[PDB]
């Protein structure tokens with residue numbers, strides 16, 4: 001469901017980000033991940049998924 | 061728009077709540093107002109309006 005997909009999506013995006021050099025991680029990508037995590041913690045798992053879509057678009 | 065309606069709705073609901081005795085204000089009403097304010101601060105003015113609908117249903 002959206003809760004599982006949000007948790008798995010945060011893990012998947014972070015796994016890709018952890019392949020980049022830390023000094024190569026765009027601020028917009030960090031911000032989008034933080035928004036997804038905030039929404040996950042609020043129980044807005046649907047909103048988390050939409051923020052994860054933004055994070056993927058920020059991947060270099 | 062949703063931003064103005066959220067701000068006005070927070071003010072309207074609070075105005076009604078401030079007519080109750082403070083020891084008569086249900087916890088669920090306080091919680092719903094706090095959620096609406098959190099969502100307003102996040103810029104989720106649409107979500108704020110949906111939380112305000114819950115707050116109105118919590119009015120005694």
Ligand SMILES: [Eu+2]
Nearest residue numbers: 042044102104
């Ligand atoms: Eu939210």
